[PDB]
Structure 1
Amino acid sequence: SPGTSFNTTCSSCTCSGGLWQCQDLPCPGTCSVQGGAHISTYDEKLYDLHGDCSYVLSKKCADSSFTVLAELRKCGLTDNENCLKAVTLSLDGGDTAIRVQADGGVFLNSIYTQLPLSAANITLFTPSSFFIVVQTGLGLQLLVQLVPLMQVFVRLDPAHQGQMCGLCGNFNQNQADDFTALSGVVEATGAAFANTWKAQAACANARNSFEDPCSLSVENENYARHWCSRLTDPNSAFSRCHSIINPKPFHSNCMFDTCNCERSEDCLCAALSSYVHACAAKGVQLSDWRDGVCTKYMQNCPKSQRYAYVVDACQPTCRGLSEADVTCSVSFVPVDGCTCPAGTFLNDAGACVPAQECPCYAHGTVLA
């Protein structure tokens, strides 16, 4: 009706003048590398990258304030079977380094560091067992997925808009300028642009891939189709997001991954998780989407923990309820994963107990 308004997560529109008067609320941009090969830039220019090197994923190219680096490694017999293997946030002109590996190990200046950590305005913590959040004060925030495989999501405070460089593009709301290399000309294809951002000159240039992995094995075809079709099903759990995010690139990603992945279940569940997380980024809460699929990620949970479809904030710790927590005031898009059940907290031993079983910490001294 006239007088009504509706606000998207990125904009707000009022029904008036017979039209929609739309203004744009601030929106933190979001780059991502999914499947180990596909890249969604800040300008939302999806393109696949089959590379074997470390690539400058994103960098405020006026200076060297930060440089999020991604190392992508070949993982199979074929040259287009890739996996993300690390995420190396280089900082202060390389003076600081936070390296999130693929198994979850996080290295601060090449020294193993358990999580959470909080120093130099940098906060590292695991919202759940599936994700690692590296919240820096410089403006950006990294959110790295480990389970089932390694994917990265980079969030930018909109102030950097029209300033960045690297693989994820300059963040200027223009999809045609993303391939602007340092030579001032837009590159043609994805790989031609990426082979300008390799870290090491000795790396092998990426190549363009037309060979659909789906055409090779018929059983791979039937399996991948029968499951990845759940994306585009209008009756499916994902359907709620269809009217916001077009699921066709996600379906193409799921097809390519599963038909090419060695543990094609892993890449299938990774693609479905990627679509779910992108939809939650837009502001849709997909729940109970793992019906008869990807349940081995429910079962493998660490003892005393349980899966949770919506981890929308802090991991509830006993230390925090004792003496507060600087880790736990960070806004991140609600990710899924294994967590202690609500009302329960994890003690320093890592086990999960209710509040009554956990000591209060005064001066860091245990008090039953």
Structure 2
Amino acid sequence: SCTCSGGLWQCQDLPCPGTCSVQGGAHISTYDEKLYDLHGDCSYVLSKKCADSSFTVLAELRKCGLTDNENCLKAVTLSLDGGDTAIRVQADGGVFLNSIYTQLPLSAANITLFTPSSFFIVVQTGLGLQLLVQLVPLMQVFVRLDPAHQGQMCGLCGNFNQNQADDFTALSGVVEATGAAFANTWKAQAACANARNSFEDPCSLSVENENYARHWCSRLTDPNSAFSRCHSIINPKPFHSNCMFDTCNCERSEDCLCAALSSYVHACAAKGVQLSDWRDGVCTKYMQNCPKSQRYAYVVDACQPTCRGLSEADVTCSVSFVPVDGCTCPAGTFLNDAGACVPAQECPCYAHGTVLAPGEVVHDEGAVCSCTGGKLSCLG
């Protein structure tokens, strides 16, 4: 916050949770905002409070094509309590709690897992870090840190100390030179192959890939585009480079293209701008592919409205996360335990875990109760 005084701007800082991210399966934006490319095939320690083993976010990046520089993120393995717990979010959406399938939501040991929409999974922990993982159109990861851990972390996302020249500090006490040379010090398994520096732009290969990627990714830097509202805040040049590189290199050009556009939108919305309606004539197959009875939404900024939640509250909705977009039930509707989207009148109040049907007067413990609009009331 900056006040206009003394002929200048008097600027103080509100505390800011740091934000790491891995987008396109290759690009990494650290806590110091040192964007760098990583074409590797191993499990890399994405972030770790390298004083202790309190938490350890791991990311498994896997080569996805003929070219050595064709990568996709494939998993996010939050190790915890020194490896005692491991929450592994795969790329299909499957969530493994201690290598066991666990549907969503789940709330235990202060850890809360839930899907704000069909595109994202939120792994909120009390240790300080929050993971927000994207599955649609492909796999991307975002990490938020309570600024208390400033200047303490290690790993790929850098030590979070407001210095871009120290981000490549390795465990040997020197700043590494380039991205891949730095990453190959943080591999999980000694048997992995070292990442290699990539100069050859895949954009130069196919002229049709060229024109496609150009004509679409140029929507970023267009001053009349929906994205212009964030131009005066976030410089879109790295995002445009990401979109170019992805779409040219991606076998599913639309998937990586829309992943890049979603990444730009989500970063800007993290900075506090609500970019909306940017999918004009583009990425609409992600409008349509929604699960039945759900619908798209551009500003999903809370939990998912559920019949159980409106009946008996929910731990889920007590987590603050950047407003992501995706598929959710529309307002005025709720999804029952069956998952289908019905209005409040069609979903039941739940007492002691008992399905108590809507608009139904019942007797319990010398009391008379009613289930009006999914809301439970008791008298006497």
Q: When the two structures are superposed, what TM-score results if normalisation uses the length of structure 1?
A: 0.97
CA-to-aligned-CA distance 1:62-97 (integer Å, 9 cap, x gap): 000000000000000000000000000000000000
SS at match of 2:355: strand
CA-to-aligned-CA distance 1:298-357 (integer Å, 9 cap, x gap): 000000000000001111011000000001110000000000000100000010000000
In the aligned structure 1, how far is the partner of 2:332 from the partner of 2:233? 34
Aligned equivalent of 2:375? none
CA-to-aligned-CA distance 1:246-283 (integer Å, 9 cap, x gap): 00000000000000000010000000000000000000
Shift of 1:54: 0.1
CA-to-aligned-CA distance 1:168-201 (integer Å, 9 cap, x gap): 0000000000000000000000000000000000
Aligned equivalent of 1:18? 7
User: Which structure would you say has the larger Rg?
Assistant: 2
CA-to-aligned-CA distance 1:24-47 (integer Å, 9 cap, x gap): 000000000000000000000000
Matched, 1:235 2:224: yes
In the aligned structure 2, how far is the partner of 1:161 from the partner of 1:173? 8
Shift of 1:219: 0.1
In the aligned structure 2, how far is the partner of 1:100 from the partner of 1:317? 23
CA-to-aligned-CA distance 1:205-239 (integer Å, 9 cap, x gap): 00000000000000000000000000000000000
Matched, 1:248 2:223: no
In the aligned structure 2, how far is the partner of 1:19 from the partner of 1:150? 44
Aligned equivalent of 2:90? 101
SS at match of 2:224: coil
1:58 aligns with one of 39, 47, 52: 47
Shift of 1:20: 0.0
In the aligned structure 2, how far is the partner of 1:72 from the partner of 1:295? 27
SS at match of 2:203: helix
In the aligned structure 2, how far is the partner of 1:101 from the partner of 1:110? 11
CA-to-aligned-CA distance 1:107-146 (integer Å, 9 cap, x gap): 0000000000000000000000000000000000000000
SS at match of 2:107: strand
Query: Which contiguous aligned blocks of 4+ residues in structure 1 show a shift greater than 2 angstroms?
Result: none
Shift of 1:56: 0.1
Q: When the two structures are superposed, what TM-score results if normalisation uses the length of structure 2?
A: 0.94
In the aligned structure 2, how far is the partner of 1:264 from the partner of 1:77? 15
In the aligned structure 2, how far is the partner of 1:149 from the partner of 1:314? 22
| Number of equivalences | 357
In the aligned structure 2, how far is the partner of 1:31 from the partner of 1:122? 20
SS at match of 1:188: coil
SS at match of 2:151: coil
In the aligned structure 1, how far is the partner of 2:16 from the partner of 2:350? 39
Matched, 1:132 2:121: yes
Please give the root-mean-square deviation of Cα atoms over the aligned residues, in Å: 1.1
SS at match of 2:322: coil
In the aligned structure 2, how far is the partner of 1:325 from the partner of 1:215? 52
Question: Tell me, which stretches of 5 or more residues in structure 2 are unaligned?
Answer: 357-379
Shift of 1:244: 0.2
In the aligned structure 1, how far is the partner of 2:33 from the partner of 2:332? 39
1:171 aligns with one of 136, 157, 160: 160
SS at match of 1:67: strand
SS at match of 2:247: helix
SS at match of 1:262: coil
2:31 aligns with one of 42, 65, 73: 42
Shift of 1:165: 0.1
Aligned equivalent of 1:310? 299
SS at match of 1:328: helix
SS at match of 2:330: coil
SS at match of 1:286: coil
In the aligned structure 1, how far is the partner of 2:125 from the partner of 2:222? 39
In the aligned structure 1, how far is the partner of 2:312 from the partner of 2:122? 22
SS at match of 1:72: strand
Matched, 1:33 2:17: no
2:213 aligns with one of 220, 224, 231: 224
